[PDB]
Amino acid sequence: FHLLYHNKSTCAESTFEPVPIQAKTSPVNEKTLHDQLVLAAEKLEDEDRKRAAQVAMITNFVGFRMYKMLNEAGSGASGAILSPPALFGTLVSFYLGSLDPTASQLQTLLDVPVKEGDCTSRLDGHKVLAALRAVQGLLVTQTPLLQSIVVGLFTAPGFRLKHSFVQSLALFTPALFPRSLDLSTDPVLATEKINRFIKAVTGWKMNLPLEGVSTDSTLLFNTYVHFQGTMRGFSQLPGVHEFWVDNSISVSVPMISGTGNFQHWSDAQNNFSVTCVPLGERATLLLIQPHCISDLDRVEALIFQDLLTWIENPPPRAIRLTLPQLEIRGSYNLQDLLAEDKLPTLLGAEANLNNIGDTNPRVGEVLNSILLELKAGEPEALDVTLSSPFLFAIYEQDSGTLHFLGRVNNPQ
């Protein structure tokens, strides 16, 4: 990963109190962000594309790792979903705000050795978030794919953020909202305000956890991801259809169906099958179905383990793929997943994050919150039908990045 480290030349503070959460705020413009993200991806050189490749490996490794900690933490009845790039960026943001021992420990969490007595063995956050942004650019370049990330920095009254830190965050995403609110006096009310505010500026209907945060918190970092996919040549089927959550629970849900030349195969060794449909010239949706429902866990553990070498490329074939229209939501506190990962205080009262503000923040939650949407774009083939729980993943052929991976036990 040499292109992610500080160079020999690289090895050589104004603050502010964020405006009150109440303050009037022009909403996000998802298509103004998208048009800028296109620009970014199209100016990329050969150096840039190599970095993208390198950063993707760190992202994928860390992604699986934390998805496993997610399912050990319990993800909920509906299923689970994770954006490694969103996750990765969040941890890199904190890396950029940290000093040793945290700074090193964080790097070690990203499987990047910290050679003691070596600046050049340190990750360059700025270079990394740049490369990370490239990979996001590559995903969305008819506009069939749309992904928008917005970060909310929610500070306790009085606590001041360093402008340098926020500068660094802009690389990860410009859609960046630092606001101040009383987190101590009524923690439950404060959670309503953060949820109200996010829906007001993004216009996104999302998991709104109502569980308050710690009363002594002075900083809340929250990442919000919103993905929209259009499956071209797929149409919504008449009426609704049964999706068997298990032998004794049905949910009626709208399906979408498409006929195309897709790759498909059955792993007879491990009792599951896979389909690979493209989402544009780059992106690819993977759909894994266990041959039997009581095997979901095992197949999930087995297939989301990092080298993804079971992705076999056979010739495409006529496939009538039918699946539920997806409107997935998921939300979790990164602190919990590390806590399951056994280094509970990695971003814990003991963390050295003295480059975030003019005092060392007490971090109350590091939330990733997801909304994924996959929808309809408008003789004899092989019918593939997802009417029971399955796993999915959006993979990107050029960066090799797993932008999404999760499980669908039930669709709203």
UniProtKB/Swiss-Prot annotation:
<keyword id="KW-0838">Vasoactive</keyword>
<dbReference type="GO" id="GO:0002019">
    <property type="term" value="P:regulation of renal output by angiotensin"/>
</dbReference>
<dbReference type="GO" id="GO:1904706">
    <property type="term" value="P:negative regulation of vascular associated smooth muscle cell proliferation"/>
</dbReference>
<dbReference type="GO" id="GO:0038166">
    <property type="term" value="P:angiotensin-activated signaling pathway"/>
</dbReference>
<dbReference type="GO" id="GO:0001999">
    <property type="term" value="P:renal response to blood flow involved in circulatory renin-angiotensin regulation of systemic arterial blood pressure"/>
</dbReference>
<feature type="glycosylation site" description="N-linked (GlcNAc...) asparagine">
    <location>
        <position position="7"/>
    </location>
</feature>
<dbReference type="GO" id="GO:0030103">
    <property type="term" value="P:vasopressin secretion"/>
</dbReference>
<dbReference type="GO" id="GO:0048662">
    <property type="term" value="P:negative regulation of smooth muscle cell proliferation"/>
</dbReference>
<keyword id="KW-0325">Glycoprotein</keyword>
<dbReference type="GO" id="GO:0002035">
    <property type="term" value="P:brain renin-angiotensin system"/>
</dbReference>
<dbReference type="InterPro" id="IPR033834">
    <property type="entry name" value="Angiotensinogen_serpin_dom"/>
</dbReference>
<dbReference type="GO" id="GO:0001568">
    <property type="term" value="P:blood vessel development"/>
</dbReference>
<dbReference type="GO" id="GO:0050727">
    <property type="term" value="P:regulation of inflammatory response"/>
</dbReference>
<dbReference type="GO" id="GO:0051402">
    <property type="term" value="P:neuron apoptotic process"/>
</dbReference>
<dbReference type="GO" id="GO:0010468">
    <property type="term" value="P:regulation of gene expression"/>
</dbReference>
<dbReference type="GO" id="GO:0001819">
    <property type="term" value="P:positive regulation of cytokine production"/>
</dbReference>
<dbReference type="InterPro" id="IPR023796">
    <property type="entry name" value="Serpin_dom"/>
</dbReference>
<dbReference type="GO" id="GO:0043410">
    <property type="term" value="P:positive regulation of MAPK cascade"/>
</dbReference>
<dbReference type="GO" id="GO:0043123">
    <property type="term" value="P:positive regulation of canonical NF-kappaB signal transduction"/>
</dbReference>
<dbReference type="InterPro" id="IPR000215">
    <property type="entry name" value="Serpin_fam"/>
</dbReference>
<feature type="glycosylation site" description="N-linked (GlcNAc...) asparagine">
    <location>
        <position position="271"/>
    </location>
</feature>
<dbReference type="GO" id="GO:0030198">
    <property type="term" value="P:extracellular matrix organization"/>
</dbReference>
<dbReference type="GO" id="GO:0010628">
    <property type="term" value="P:positive regulation of gene expression"/>
</dbReference>
<keyword id="KW-1015">Disulfide bond</keyword>
<dbReference type="GO" id="GO:0008217">
    <property type="term" value="P:regulation of blood pressure"/>
</dbReference>
<comment type="similarity">
    <text>Belongs to the serpin family.</text>
</comment>
<dbReference type="GO" id="GO:0008285">
    <property type="term" value="P:negative regulation of cell population proliferation"/>
</dbReference>
<dbReference type="InterPro" id="IPR036186">
    <property type="entry name" value="Serpin_sf"/>
</dbReference>
<protein>
    <recommendedName>
        <fullName>Angiotensinogen</fullName>
    </recommendedName>
</protein>
<keyword id="KW-0732">Signal</keyword>
<dbReference type="GO" id="GO:0030432">
    <property type="term" value="P:peristalsis"/>
</dbReference>
<dbReference type="GO" id="GO:0005615">
    <property type="term" value="C:extracellular space"/>
</dbReference>
<dbReference type="GO" id="GO:0045723">
    <property type="term" value="P:positive regulation of fatty acid biosynthetic process"/>
</dbReference>
<dbReference type="GO" id="GO:0002018">
    <property type="term" value="P:renin-angiotensin regulation of aldosterone production"/>
</dbReference>
<dbReference type="GO" id="GO:0000165">
    <property type="term" value="P:MAPK cascade"/>
</dbReference>
<dbReference type="GO" id="GO:0046622">
    <property type="term" value="P:positive regulation of organ growth"/>
</dbReference>
<dbReference type="GO" id="GO:0005576">
    <property type="term" value="C:extracellular region"/>
</dbReference>
<dbReference type="GO" id="GO:0042981">
    <property type="term" value="P:regulation of apoptotic process"/>
</dbReference>
<dbReference type="GO" id="GO:0035774">
    <property type="term" value="P:positive regulation of insulin secretion involved in cellular response to glucose stimulus"/>
</dbReference>
<dbReference type="GO" id="GO:0040018">
    <property type="term" value="P:positive regulation of multicellular organism growth"/>
</dbReference>
<dbReference type="GO" id="GO:0043524">
    <property type="term" value="P:negative regulation of neuron apoptotic process"/>
</dbReference>
<dbReference type="GO" id="GO:0001991">
    <property type="term" value="P:regulation of systemic arterial blood pressure by circulatory renin-angiotensin"/>
</dbReference>
